Amino acid sequence: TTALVCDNGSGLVKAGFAGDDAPRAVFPSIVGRPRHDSYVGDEAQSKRGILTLKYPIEHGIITNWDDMEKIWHHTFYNELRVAPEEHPTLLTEAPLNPKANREKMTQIMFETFNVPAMYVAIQAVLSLYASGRTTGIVLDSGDGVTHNVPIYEGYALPHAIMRLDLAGRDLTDYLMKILTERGYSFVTTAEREIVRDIKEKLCYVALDFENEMATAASSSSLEKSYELPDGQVITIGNERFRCPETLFQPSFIGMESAGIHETTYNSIMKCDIDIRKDLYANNVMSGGTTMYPGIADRMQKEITALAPSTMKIKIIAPPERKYSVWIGGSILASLSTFQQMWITKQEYDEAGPSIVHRKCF
Amino acid sequence: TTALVCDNGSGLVKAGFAGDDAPRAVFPSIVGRPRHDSYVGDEAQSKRGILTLKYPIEHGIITNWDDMEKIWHHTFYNELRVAPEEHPTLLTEAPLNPKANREKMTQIMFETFNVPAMYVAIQAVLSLYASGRTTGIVLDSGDGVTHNVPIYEGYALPHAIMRLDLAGRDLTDYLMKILTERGYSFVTTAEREIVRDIKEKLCYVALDFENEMATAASSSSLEKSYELPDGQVITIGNERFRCPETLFQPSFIGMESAGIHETTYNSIMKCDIDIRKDLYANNVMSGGTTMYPGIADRMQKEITALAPSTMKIKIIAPPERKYSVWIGGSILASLSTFQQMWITKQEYDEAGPSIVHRKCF
Ligand SMILES: Nc1ncnc2c1ncn2[C@@H]1O[C@H](COP(=O)(O)OP(=O)(O)OP(=O)(O)O)[C@@H](O)[C@H]1O
Ligand SMILES: Nc1ncnc2c1ncn2[C@@H]1O[C@H](COP(=O)(O)OP(=O)(O)OP(=O)(O)O)[C@@H](O)[C@H]1O
Ligand SMILES: C/C1=C/C(=O)O[C@@H]2C[C@@H](CC[C@H](C)/C=C\C=C\CC1)O[C@@](O)([C@@H]1CSC(=O)N1)C2
Ligand SMILES: C/C1=C/C(=O)O[C@@H]2C[C@@H](CC[C@H](C)/C=C\C=C\CC1)O[C@@](O)([C@@H]1CSC(=O)N1)C2
Ligand SMILES: [Mg+2]
Ligand SMILES: [Mg+2]
């Protein structure tokens, strides 16, 4: 009976059961086939020297499905200890995800895994119920993708979906750079991983850059040392809010401009006025990234700038937003009105891929 | 730039233009040829000799597709004299018609019609819309069939739906029976048509199959004598209501099938006791057969005498409650909002024919 939720994030894969208050398995979204079978997850990584590791998925989109399945499989078997062709199933996707993909995706569940039933939901949209909403503009900033998702009655709006190709890993990478720069090494991939945690444990969203930037060099009372695994420990200036600053500065690492709140306006201002109003006081926002301090109040103002005078702008940062996408699934999967919403072998059996094509979740 | 409305009525077809507060089209959904290329419409009518014309749409469901193909064709052209690949399209589906049938006329349409965009809905709902409601039981007492469709704010209650195969052209093959007793003709379709003409003319579902049926040996006051083509006038007694009434008596044949009102009830009953009141206080007579006057105050009895005392019950039965289906749909087909629903040429050449099973409204 128990269905299964799996947010196949670009770098992370959240997956547990239905209704389950939280995805049980949350491991690395990559695989490694022989250097000269494959392996995946922590294991996959646990074998650097002799493995050719790659993210089966790129920008929250599947590319080498081999590894992909080489995951899926590991995910029930080597992972969830459960029978595929034995449980209702839910998969997440990215906004404006290419038809044949979303279709190919299904091809495999019944085909190879003979999964009984299944469905597909936009990572976004998931996060939206994960908030108790069926309409709003979301901000699922994972490890490597970014979209502004105009939703209504729980049904999205393509033509108005701004994607800001950039995220999670960017900054992490970003950082290292502005550090190897401030006297510090780290150019091996293994070092990058160090930085991230660092990037997470410390980095924050400066309510104000300039006001903050000076202070950095002016005061200090805004930084700390780091238990570098090596043993040696170290601290960082401006950076703490410079890296996460890149978020509003798609001109911090080269890039193309625009940027977040903008691409947001540049997402809302592509949405039939009638909605706009109500699209303004509901900013949800999932994915590792969004997990920042002050990131909150920071945006609010950002927009109010563009945000016309007397308009109430409300950003909602779900304390658990890191999994909302998954958490959403957990729910919808585990629901009633959703029964008929599934896809069936009997159905997939008779039709083909195009069968999947339906309405909002 | 304009869309279309087509009521594929079991044994009839009404059509016109979205908005157009009349459907300009209404005709015989029959196809026929020489006993030994083809003849559709009332053209087929005048051929009882050379033609052995068979009707399509089988109880509301298609059957000789290749055949039905002509029906439609006969439309835009001979009839409306209009263009297909140039107007959006809407089609009434059959209340709980298989998914197989679906993608058929859907692909067929486009494929062998190159249509802009097409959508399809159950007949039973439009009729509902067609009355200012979106909830409450409806009854497509049309020609070939008569269904009981509970509706909930736009959703039908599959599980909770009833389908009775008696209707219009049902009570007819019969009428031609009851009469062979006072001794008369009416055996050939030639003669069979005359029947319905009479039915719809005189026939009525009054009230008592008793105190009413008591007036019989009684006061030979109120009866009549229709002047048939054969010039010769004819007499009729209780048959003026022995035929229609049969709906509250299947045993008139042997249908060990449920009495209408009862099925309706049955339907309402199989519904969520919560919503049951609304769908109870609401009941529509979508169907030509649903015309036998005085049928108004009638049904009330049939049911409240089963409907829990503390209530109230009304059976919305408008005048054009003979096209409500077509009418109601000729609305959906008129609204900027409707686009979000349509299935355009490109919304098919990419998503296979199964992209039509899924709606919002
Ligand atoms: N507390 C945090 N603050 C900021 N960034 C974080 C935090 N925790 C994780 N991240 C970053 O967000 C990225 C992860 O997100 P998520 O779990 O959002 O990715 P996915 O869903 O795996 O990928 P994507 O959403 O890009 O398709 C991580 O790889 C990491 O770089
Ligand atoms: N005034 C009337 N009184 C009685 N019966 C009528 C009247 N007008 C039409 N009918 C009968 O009702 C039948 C028609 O209904 P409708 O137009 O409801 O049929 P469809 O569209 O062919 O079928 P369905 O509605 O069951 O899908 C006719 O074929 C006819 O025999
Ligand atoms: C705590 C953690 C979080 C995470 O989300 O990791 C994902 C997955 C990870 C895979 C590569 C590493 C070596 C192998 C195992 C990692 C396990 C846990 C790492 O590559 C990221 O780190 C990239 C690199 S730099 C960044 O910003 N994203 C995102
Ligand atoms: C006024 C009318 C109404 C109608 O509803 O016709 C429909 C369609 C009709 C098709 C066959 C005939 C020869 C051809 C053209 C008829 C045109 C108009 C007839 O066969 C019915 O008559 C049958 C016969 S007896 C009955 O109960 N249904 C129902
Ligand atoms: Mg994500
Ligand atoms: Mg009809």
Swiss-Prot record, chains A, B:
EC number(s) from the headed UniProt entry: 3.6.4.-
Residues found modified as Tele-methylhistidine: 59
GO biological process terms held by the UniProt record: actin filament bundle assembly; actin filament polymerization; mesenchyme migration; positive regulation of gene expression; skeletal muscle fiber development; skeletal muscle thin filament assembly
Pfam family, one: Actin
UniProt catalytic activity: ATP + H2O = ADP + phosphate + H(+)
Superkingdom of origin: Eukaryota
Residues the record lists as N6-malonyllysine modifications: 47
Protein keywords: Acetylation, ADP-ribosylation, ATP-binding, Cytoplasm, Cytoskeleton, Hydrolase, Methylation, Muscle protein, Nucleotide-binding, Oxidation
PTM: MICAL1 and MICAL2 produce the (R)-S-oxide form. The (R)-S-oxide form is reverted by MSRB1 and MSRB2, which promotes actin repolymerization. Can be mono-ADP-ribosylated on Arg-163 by SpvB of Salmonella spp. This modification blocks subsequent polymerization and leads to cell death.
Keyword ATP-binding: yes
Gene Ontology molecular function, alphabetical: actin monomer binding; ATP binding; calcium ion binding; calcium-dependent protein binding; cytoskeletal motor activator activity; hydrolase activity; identical protein binding; magnesium ion binding
Coiled coil (UniProt feature): none
Leader sequence segment: none
Record's GO cellular component terms: actin filament; actin filament bundle; cell body; cytoplasm; filamentous actin; filopodium; lamellipodium; skeletal muscle myofibril
Modified residue annotations for N6-methyllysine: 70
Function description: Actins are highly conserved proteins that are involved in various types of cell motility and are ubiquitously expressed in all eukaryotic cells.
PANTHER family: ACTIN
Note: In vertebrates 3 main groups of actin isoforms, alpha, beta and gamma have been identified. The alpha actins are found in muscle tissues and are a major constituent of the contractile apparatus. The beta and gamma actins coexist in most cell types as components of the cytoskeleton and as mediators of internal cell motility.
Subunit description: Polymerization of globular actin (G-actin) leads to a structural filament (F-actin) in the form of a two-stranded helix. Each actin can bind to 4 others. Interacts with alpha-actinin. Identified in a complex composed of ACTA1, COBL, GSN and TMSB4X. Interacts with TTID. Interacts (via its C-terminus) with USP25.
Family the UniProt entry places it in: Belongs to the actin family.
Name of the protein this chain belongs to: Actin, alpha skeletal muscle
UniProt organism field: Oryctolagus cuniculus (Rabbit)
